Amino acid sequence: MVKITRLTTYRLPPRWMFLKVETDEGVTGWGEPVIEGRARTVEAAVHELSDYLIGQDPSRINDLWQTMYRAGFYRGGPILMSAIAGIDQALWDIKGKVLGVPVYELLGGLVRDKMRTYSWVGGDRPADVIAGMKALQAGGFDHFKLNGCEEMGIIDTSRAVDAAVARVAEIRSAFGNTVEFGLDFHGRVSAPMAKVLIKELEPYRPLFIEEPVLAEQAETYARLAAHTHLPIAAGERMFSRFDFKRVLEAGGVSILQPDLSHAGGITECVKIAAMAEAYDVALAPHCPLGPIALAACLHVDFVSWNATLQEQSMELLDYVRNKADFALEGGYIRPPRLPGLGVDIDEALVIERSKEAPPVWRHADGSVAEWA
Amino acid sequence: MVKITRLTTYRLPPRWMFLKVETDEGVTGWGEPVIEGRARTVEAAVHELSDYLIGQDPSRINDLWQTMYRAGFYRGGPILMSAIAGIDQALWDIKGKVLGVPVYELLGGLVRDKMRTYSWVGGDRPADVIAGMKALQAGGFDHFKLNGCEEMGIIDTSRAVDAAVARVAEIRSAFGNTVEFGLDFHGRVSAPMAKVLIKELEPYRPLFIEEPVLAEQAETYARLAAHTHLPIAAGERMFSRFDFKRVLEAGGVSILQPDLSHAGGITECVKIAAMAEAYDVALAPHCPLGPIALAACLHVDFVSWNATLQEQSMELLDYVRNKADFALEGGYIRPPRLPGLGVDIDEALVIERSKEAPPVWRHADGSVAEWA
Amino acid sequence: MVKITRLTTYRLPPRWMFLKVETDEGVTGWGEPVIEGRARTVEAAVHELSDYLIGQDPSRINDLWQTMYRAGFYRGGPILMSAIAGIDQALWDIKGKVLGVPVYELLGGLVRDKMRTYSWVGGDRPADVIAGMKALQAGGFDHFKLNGCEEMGIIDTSRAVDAAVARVAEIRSAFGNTVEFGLDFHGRVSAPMAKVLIKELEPYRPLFIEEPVLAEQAETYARLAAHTHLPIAAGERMFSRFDFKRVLEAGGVSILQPDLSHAGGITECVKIAAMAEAYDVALAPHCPLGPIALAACLHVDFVSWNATLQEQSMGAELLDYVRNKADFALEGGYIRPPRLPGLGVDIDEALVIERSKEAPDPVWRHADGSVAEWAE
Amino acid sequence: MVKITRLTTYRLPPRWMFLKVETDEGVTGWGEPVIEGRARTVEAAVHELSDYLIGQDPSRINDLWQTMYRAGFYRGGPILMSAIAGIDQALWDIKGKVLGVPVYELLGGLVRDKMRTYSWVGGDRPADVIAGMKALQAGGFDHFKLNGCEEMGIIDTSRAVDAAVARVAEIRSAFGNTVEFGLDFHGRVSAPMAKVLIKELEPYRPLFIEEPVLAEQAETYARLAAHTHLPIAAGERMFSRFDFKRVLEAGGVSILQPDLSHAGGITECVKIAAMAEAYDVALAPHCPLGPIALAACLHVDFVSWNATLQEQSMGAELLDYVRNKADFALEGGYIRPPRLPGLGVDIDEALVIERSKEAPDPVWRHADGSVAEWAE
Ligand SMILES: [Cl-]
Ligand SMILES: [Cl-]
Ligand SMILES: [Cl-]
Ligand SMILES: [Cl-]
């Protein structure tokens, strides 16, 4: 019997955390929880959950998942589900290594041969965004994600709607319909301005509108979608099937974006994907993170018929020894090749950059602004 | 033990009424109920409710609020809730004075440092409105409220839609998107004309449409909002949480406008604000009244994270000795400073102008027109 | 061109208010708003609304109603609708005297020849209630209203449910199915106890359960009604068609009980009755009041096919202010249509003026000191 | 310009955590988050949130609450809301000490003069529970909370339903309707058995059925409630207004039980209470905790008209950390409002520091080896 022996967390110099699960057989799994902003809390959670893992057979991923989720506390929100997601990724990494195959082979094998990706593109001017997109267009990309919000702060006025719309107008003029781009507001649109903004963006036909407002109610997406032809994307801030069911039942979300490093890992994200397919909703997993999280996302994409686009942030390949496995041709990525998640982690590099490891936005009136 | 000793009402030369609550400790509270149009009835109500106050400890605002609301009669509509609102304001004024702090400090302290205001601007011609707005624009204002209705009487025809739309068109041409304005119909739009009027106003992007029709059903706002990108504002004619729940559940209202001097005062308006936040609806309290009502509104604004805009009618400062506390920089007002509501009332002036204290609109067919 | 010249209000001994509308042709109308508890505020409302009346032709009741309701203010509410109701009753009194017929003849004439009435019966113990019911039974009454609970105190425990049921059981045992009684709870049951109380009352078959809890939500009655076979009655705390439509849409109420003296008078209550008929809801107008409000109720009952039972407070003090006492006599618990022109009450005005000069003028709390919701 | 200077956490014997917020003016606030089971994670959350507090004026409780809730992260959840709750309690403790009054005086003052409490009673067999209830009954208590099931094991068979009912029947037989008891099932009933269990418990009239199953759907409670007259209680597993609104919209819950130590503290629970009042839902705050959480609960109860019953864990260990023990004395099961400024607890800080140095630190499975959902 294989047994889990130790878990180790590593805080890393951007805003990442890796975890390492060791077994008595010398088979080691890697995981990547979301820390962004609550790193000490997530780390503590990982180590508290470690109590259910040490001494246990990591082959029983379902048992361990259920144990962490329901057995010793209330059902998790953003902290606990991130800790679970990280552990789950590592467990799947182990199982694939033990059985000598990529994770997707365990989960029923390939449903596709390659996966379409898209890249976030930044820039201060609209000129800076155009330039970034053109350089990636030379590298075969034709699908992008842009921040929808130009200015620092929320879209609150007709002036602020027009500035964001004009920025998009300039970006679209440089390409016409030769490229596709999604627009990500990070919830930084006021509820009153949401519908006019969405209507004004319609001539420039973005691929989706991601998180226009922050959903207080499940009805809000359905109500927004009724007014527009533009597809709405959401899922980043939802952590389990129980959260996603609410959103799917109301409708109004065209593209679901669960985060593998937040929504309870591979075990739960495969279930979210299958659930979504039954509502005719496409899957586009949220991945602004590192290579381990991206590998996890790819395994879900390669077994789920409804997966359409995979976000990637290509940095992440620093800690990966097998960089070519994640190379992109025409915006497409291939299935991971090595056993487990398919990431050969440079553990020595991880240890060194973890040894040297170290804000609030407000509106004009002094009131706190919701996190981006 | 502090005890309430006397209540006194004062009818004042515009269309205001102040009330004064005296205690045996010499700490005096001020309140401002809505009388507009039924002044003798509201005054009688205040004095009947006085029976629950005389001899009682004013520290127990919650007890007194509940006693006035439910204990001796049916639950209040427009008359009783106004009388309660006036008394409640005075009770809070007392508590703040007793404890030596502004009311917002009692209610959990500041959630913001300053509060954005907007001003009603009148004028017979569209030239007269432009001129009024430009003078306030020199005084730092960029947010306004205009009457939507030009002509005397209701918007009933295509001709009357076009005239109101052309007036707004001329106002917007003078500023472009440099100013924001809301449009207040006082319910003076016929149900059949509401949707065409709202569609015709869309190019001129007002900040909100306030009270377009008078809501017979709770469904009417939801149905209107489905057709437009423009935010709908409502709340003036609703008097308790029980009235507001109905409107919030249906949705369709973007901006809630309870009146502090109608909707049961600070005690109830803080609850309406919190309720609204749970539906992702912004608060913009209705205040076309005097300084006491405005101070009450500010205390709610300064503790409620969802408050966005505060109407003010700057006259009101005549009866206030501490005028600078309500001064406006860039459209922003500061938190009240003095204990209680933060209004030092010129009681001598109130007494004198109360000593010298003194219509029906019809349609063309002779039928009575609903009140504006 | 007849004009209203004056309105005068009178406060009277059984906490009633009468109102008198005079015209320049010498034709006088009487009305009765409900005051229970806010007498000075309702009285002030009546005189404020009088501004819309003095100088106007009282024949335009529809115009005057609409003017009082929507012209100078926000609509509705318990104060304004009670002021409006009393004024509307007097205007109808005038119109009938002018045209020389009872009010029902104006509103399309008789739909029935007599109207079943029923009375409240009180008593400290079940024996006292039984005796009062039997005394009324010897007069031909077989329909009754009783308080659901002994007296003050909210039903919030199993002990309290059980005592309330035991009382009802005892009263039912004395009669079997030979009488009908409705049970008025005055909203004095906590929401957690509502369903068990209703369930435990089922074997004793009350004709209706009236206001078991206070209607916070639109769905409250509908939810209660899905649990029981017992008819739910409500409406005494609703003051306009717009309030009643919500209740009727949701369902849950089998018997609507608008108050003619609270819900905007005859003009509004005939529209409430017609609305109710469309949802197959019976009309049993609320009337624990004086002879003017009762006459107004009768006129609605005599034109509304869905009217089923009329409450009256007669079970002698009601008749004190009326000279035409025989027009309100009861035979087998049935009342005849009013006979004289207008509302059909010959008001002893000199007795009114007399008892008005000598009229003078509480809060209940739980054990923990918190206020209890108002009951009477 | 007062500033927060330091936050310190203390883990204590009955698996409680106390938290202490210090300021530069020497005014100290105490708070009590709930830790049961994830102590290290909640403790880490408190110190992470401390970054938003150190250097700031504690008078801006609304600003600090909103900053902790929405500024640096995704909202909510059982960990963060518990950290926030404990911090919010201490800030309120500070504000009250600064202004020299109990917290309830700040939030609009008393709505009641005393608050009905009730205690959990345990026991291996029904005889043991009866005895414990009788021992408390001699102290004036007539309201109780009992475990719905003997102990661990899910009620998933007719045999298990029958044993649970037989226990309740025996306990009820000893008292008749002379006492009230609520039944806490801790979600330990399978969904297939939920309705029969509730139906079979009906004759013995529990005051409420608390958390019979785990709320998967919004409609779960509403569906259960349509089947029974028994009141359903829930809310201990909900952590914000946004969670509670869903339950209240759907209906099904008669008694809302937010935890002051889990649902974002005083600031949030007063808003939860006000939300509940609008749906006519009673407030019975969850509090199996220490004296700081209890005091926080009391302040909400004393300003919220809809508050009905306050749980306490007193039925001596609670009072161990408090020097002002008399302020929490019970008479007829009623507690008085807290007397001292702030939360009204005089914390034996030296006793706290002492017992904190000596604090040290399971998973249940079905017969088939699968994990059982967490219960306590
Ligand atoms: Cl969590
Ligand atoms: Cl009223
Ligand atoms: Cl009213
Ligand atoms: Cl959390």
CB contacts under 8 A, A 335-364 vs D, are 359-361
The active-site residue, picked from C186, C229, C262, C366, is C186
CA pair distance C85, B20, nearest whole angstrom: 33
H/E/C letters for each residue in D321-335? HECCHHHHCEECCEE
In the three-class reduction of DSSP (H, G, I as helix; E, B as strand; rest coil), residue C180 is classed as: strand
In chain D, residues with a C-beta closer than 8 Å to the C-beta of B275 are: 274-275, 278
Q: Is C143 a catalytic residue?
A: no
For residue A360, the chain D residue with the least C-alpha distance is D71
Phi/psi at D113 (nearest 5 deg)?
Answer: -100, -25
Helix axes B265-277, B291-303, angle to 10 degrees: 40
The secondary structure element, H or E, covering residue B246 is helix B241-250
Chain position carrying tokens 């004198």: B352
- A52-90 burial, b at 16+ Cβ within 10 Å, e below that, comes to bbeebebeebebbbbbbbbbbbbbbbbbbbbbbbbbbbb
Return the ligand number nearest the Cα of B85: 2
Counting one residue from B and one from D, how many pairs have CB atoms under 8 Å apart? 89
Counting one residue from C and one from D, how many pairs have CB atoms under 8 Å apart? 57
CB contacts under 8 A, D 150-179 vs A, are none
Contact B274 D249 (CB under 8 A): no
User: Tokens at residue C262, please?
Assistant: 């609270």
Tell me: is residue B352 an annotated ligand-binding position. no
The active-site residue, picked from C143, C262, C286, C299, is C286
- The domain made up of C1-102+340-376 has a fold known as Enolase-like; domain 1 (3.30.390)
CA pair distance C229, A203, nearest whole angstrom: 59
Chains adjacent to C (≥3 CB pairs closer than 8 angstroms): B, D
D6: left (phi over 0), alpha (psi -120 to 50) or beta: beta
Q: Ligand 4 centre and the CA of A361: distance in Å?
A: 21
Nearest to B225 by CA among B192, B189, B255: B255
Contact D229 C195 (CB under 8 A): yes
Nearest to B95 by CA among B83, B104, B84, B85: B104
Domain B1-102+338-372 bears CATH identifier 3.30.390.10: yes
CA pair distance A2, A22, nearest whole angstrom: 10
Nearest neighbour of A159 by CB, restricted to B177, B231, B280: B177
User: Tokens at residue D332, please?
Assistant: 């007829």
Nearest to B306 by CA among B273, B270, B260: B273
What secondary structure does DSSP assign to A167-216, as a single string? Answer: HHHHHHHTTGGGSEEEEE--S-B-HHHHHHHHHHHGGG--S-EE-SS--S
Helix, strand, coil fractions of chain A, as percent rounded to 5: 40, 15, 40
Q: Which residues, in sequence order, are CB contacts of B136 under 8 Å at separation 6+?
A: B119, B121, B144
Q: How far is CA D191 from the centre of its chain?
A: 25
C280: left (phi over 0), alpha (psi -120 to 50) or beta: left
Q: How far is CA D287 from the centre of its chain?
A: 3
Substitution target in D11, D35, D36, D38 with the highest count of A β-carbons within 10 Å is: D38
Q: Ligand 2 centre and the CA of C155: distance in Å?
A: 28
Nearest neighbour of A44 by CB, restricted to D41, D77, D372: D41
Resolution of the model in angstroms: 2.0
Solved using:
X-ray
CA pair distance A267, A248, nearest whole angstrom: 19
Q: Ligand 3 centre and the CA of B13: distance in Å?
A: 24
What does the CA dihedral D145, D151, D157, D159 come to, rounded to 10 degrees?
-90
Contact A77 D72 (CB under 8 A): no
Nearest to A78 by CA among D83, C60, B74: D83
- A99-116 burial, b at 16+ Cβ within 10 Å, e below that, comes to eebbbbbbbeeeeeebbb
Tell me: is residue C268 an annotated ligand-binding position. no
CA pair distance D254, D246, nearest whole angstrom: 14
The answer to whether residues A106 and A302 touch, using CB atoms and an 8 Å cutoff, is: no
Nearest neighbour of B371 by CB, restricted to C52, C73, C362: C73
Question: What CATH number does the domain located at D103-339 have?
Answer: 3.20.20.120
The residue ranges of every structural domain in chain D are 1-102+340-376, 103-339
Nearest to D258 by CA among D285, D231, D291, D298: D285
Substitution target in C157, C165, C190 with the highest count of D β-carbons within 10 Å is: C157
Residue B322 DSSP symbol: -
Tally DSSP H helices, then E strands, for chain D.
Answer: 12, 13
Diameter of chain D by CA atoms?
65
Decide if B228 touches D, using CB distance below 8 A: no
The active-site residue, picked from D186, D227, D299, D366, is D186
C-alpha angle with apex C14: C13 to C15, nearest 5 degrees?
85
What secondary structure does DSSP assign to C334-376, as a single string? Answer: EEPPP-SSBT---B-HHHHHHHHHT------B-TTSPBPPP--
For residue D307, the chain C residue with the least C-alpha distance is C370
Contact A216 B278 (CB under 8 A): yes
Contact D110 B62 (CB under 8 A): yes
User: Tokens at residue A157, please?
Assistant: 């006025």
Phi/psi at C320 (nearest 5 deg)?
Answer: -60, -30
In chain C, residues with a C-beta closer than 8 Å to the C-beta of B368 are: 63, 66-67, 70-71
Q: Is B363 a catalytic residue?
A: no
CA pair distance D94, D241, nearest whole angstrom: 24
CB contacts under 8 A, A 194-213 vs B, are 195-196, 198-199, 213
Tell me: is residue C236 an annotated ligand-binding position. yes
Counting one residue from A and one from D, how many pairs have CB atoms under 8 Å apart? 114
Q: Going by beta carbons, is chain D in contact with chain B, meaning 3 or more pairs sit under 8 Å apart?
A: yes
Decide if C216 touches D, using CB distance below 8 A: yes
Q: Ligand 1 centre and the CA of A81: distance in Å?
A: 6
Q: Which residues, in sequence order, are CB contacts of C139 under 8 Å at separation 6+?
A: C330, C333
Q: How far is CA C283 from the centre of its chain?
A: 11
Contact B107 D107 (CB under 8 A): yes
Return the ligand number nearest the Cα of A81: 1
Q: How far is B95 from chain D (nearest CA, A)?
A: 8
- Radius of gyration of chain D from its Cα atoms, rounded to whole angstroms: 21
- Type of residue found at C341: P
CA pair distance A157, B230, nearest whole angstrom: 12
Decide if B184 touches C, using CB distance below 8 A: no
Domain spanning A103-337: which CATH class is it, in words? alpha beta
Nearest neighbour of D278 by CB, restricted to B105, B245, B305: B245
Q: How far is A252 from chain B (nearest CA, A)?
A: 14
CB contacts under 8 A, C 37-96 vs B, are 37-38, 40-41, 43-45, 47-48, 52, 63, 66-67, 70-80
Confirm whether C1-102+340-376 and C103-339 share one CATH topology. Answer: no
Nearest to A97 by CA among A206, A2, A18, A172: A2
The answer to whether residues B260 and B301 touch, using CB atoms and an 8 Å cutoff, is: no
CA pair distance B289, B272, nearest whole angstrom: 20
